Amino acid sequence: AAKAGDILLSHSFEEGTTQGWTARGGVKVDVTAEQAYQGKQSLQTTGRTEAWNGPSLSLTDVVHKNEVVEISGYVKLVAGSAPADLKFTVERRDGNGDTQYDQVNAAEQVTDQKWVKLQGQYSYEQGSSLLLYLESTDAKAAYLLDEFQIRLVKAA
Numbered sequence: 001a002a003k004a005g006d007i008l009l010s011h012s013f014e015e016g017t018t019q020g021w022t023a024r025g026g027v028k029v030d031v032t033a034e035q036a037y038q039g040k041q042s043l044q045t046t047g048r049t050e051a052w053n054g055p056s057l058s059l060t061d062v063v064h065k066n067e068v069v070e071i072s073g074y075v076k077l078v079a080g081s082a083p084a085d086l087k088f089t090v091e092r093r094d095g096n097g098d099t100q101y102d103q104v105n106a107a108e109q110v111t112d113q114k115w116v117k118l119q120g121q122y123s124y125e126q127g128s129s130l131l132l133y134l135e136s137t138d139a140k141a142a143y144l145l146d147e148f149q150i151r152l153v154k155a156a
């Protein structure tokens with residue numbers, strides 16, 4: 001339906017809602033006015049106990065077969081957290097219904113002192129469901145996300 005260069009999703013978190021982002025694990029995912037990269041608000045994740053926990057977003061309705069997309073956003077650790085590495089991952093059901101974990105970007109070191117840009121391209125060849133999440137190998141890190149975007153690079 002879309003063409004190269006089109007915005008598929010854009011999240012500033014400047015209204016009341018998490019704009020579809022939801023908890024993965026027994027975590028708390030909500031909007032905060034304490035910190036932001038742009039505007040007044042960002043998306044905050046706390047209460048992580050395992051490394052696979054984080055804020056998550058279904059992409060099932062956003063990304064379709066063989067489309068190349070570009071996923072980006074700005075991240076920062078919650079005040080007090082030690083330096084930790086953050087990346088985006090897509091959990092995908094393949095053609096057979098089997099679970100696959102696809103890498104979007106290399107993990108970047110992030111601190112509680114500055115916002116860091118994360119970005120990578122993504123596509124898939126077979127599958128029925130797609131779930132994006134933001135994770136750290138540090139199982140207890142808490143962190144913020146702002147100015148999240150997905151852009152179509154190449155139509156299918």
Ligand SMILES: [Ca+2]
Pocket residue numbers: 012013014036037038039040041042146147
């Ligand atoms: Ca914002």
